[PDB]
Amino acid sequence: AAPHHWLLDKLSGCYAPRPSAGPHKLRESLPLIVFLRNRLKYALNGREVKAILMQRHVKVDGKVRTDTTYPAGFMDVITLDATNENFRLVYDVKGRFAVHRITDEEASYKLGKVKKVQLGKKGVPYVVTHDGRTIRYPDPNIKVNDTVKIDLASGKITDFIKFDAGKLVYVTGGRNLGRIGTIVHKERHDGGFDLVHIKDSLDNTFVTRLNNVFVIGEQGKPYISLPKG
């Protein structure tokens, strides 16, 4: 009854935890019970993960948010107070949620793909992201599928990454879900299979969608740290 992304062992139970509503969707997130209890194993059961949630160790996106099924989606920096645990969780190359450990100056921010820019009411420019941070007043040159950098103390955009040909992009969606390498090709079609294409070890080619891909930095310099093997 589980998805593939959670890295959930089959010998666990019968009812799978539906995440509650929140920032991200159901299909692109993992809740805190499947995060803490059975992935990096700070708990043994739902009772004691509710106990540490009542103790309020979790500090995801700089706020506490004491809830069992809180849908932590892409790169919400899970922060735990004891042993200064800073966790940025991204996608691995085979579809799961690889939770990388980072440090404090990297967990002081996150980034987010812009979805739409609106002239909503009363002359106010407007920007949303995958956690829905409706932050005030970016520059006019925010296209769709660019990348804002959230402040995580206040909410303001601090840095901006422009989407164009020659940018380091992350793909979350479809049969390319979780690949990095961002350059063999660029092809913007007019309604589907439109993208920037991603290399491999032998620099192979790949096809995805615009909304299923979003930028993380430059060719060699992302200010996100990434795990390795």
Question: How deeply is 32 buried, as exposed, middle or buried, from its count of CB atoms within 10 A (0-12, 13-18, 19+)?
Answer: buried
Among 18, 63, 143, 162, contact with RNA (rule: CB under 7 A):
63
Residue that the structure tokens 């299923």 belong to: 212
Give the closest residue to 150 by CA, choosing from 218, 61, 63.
61
190 binds other proteins (CB under 8 A): yes
Q: Among RNA, other proteins, none, what binds residue 146 when CB lies within 5 to 8 Å by partner kind?
A: none
x/- string (CB under 8 A) for other proteins, residues 126-145? ----------xxxxxx----
Shortest separation between residue 138's beta carbon and other proteins, angstroms: 8
Binding to RNA, residues 3-42 (CB under 7 A): 10, 20-23
Sheet strands side by side (includes 179-180): 179-180, 168-171, 213-217
Report the residue number, 85 or 212, with the smaller CB distance to RNA. 212
Closest CB to RNA among residues 10, 47: 10
Cβ neighbours for 228, distance < 8 A, ≥ 6 positions apart = none
Cβ atoms 77, 101 nearer than 8 A: no
Nearer to RNA, 61 or 146 (CB): 61
User: Which of RNA, other proteins, none sits in contact with 221, Cβ below 5 to 8 A by type?
Assistant: none
Closest CA to 142 of 172, 166, 116: 116
When binding is defined by CB under 8 A, the residue of 3, 125, 173, 174 that contacts other proteins is 125
Instruction: Name 215's bridge partners.
Output: 169
Is the Cβ of residue 48 or residue 211 nearer to RNA in the bound state? 211
Only one of the segments 63-71, 92-100, 158-166, 177-185 lies at the binding site for RNA (rule: CB under 7 A); that segment is 63-71
Candidates 39, 130, 133, 167: give the one binding RNA (CB under 7 A).
133
Q: Residue 79 gets which letter from DSSP?
A: E
Tokens found for residue 154: 């206040």
| Residue number with CB closer to other proteins (140 or 229) | 140
End-to-end CA gap in the chain: 30
Distance CA 159, CA 150 (A): 8
Q: Positive or negative, the Cα torsion across 45, 51, 54, 56? A: negative
- Can you give the binding site for RNA, defined by CB under 7 A? 10, 20-23, 63, 65, 70, 118-119, 131-136, 155, 192, 209, 211
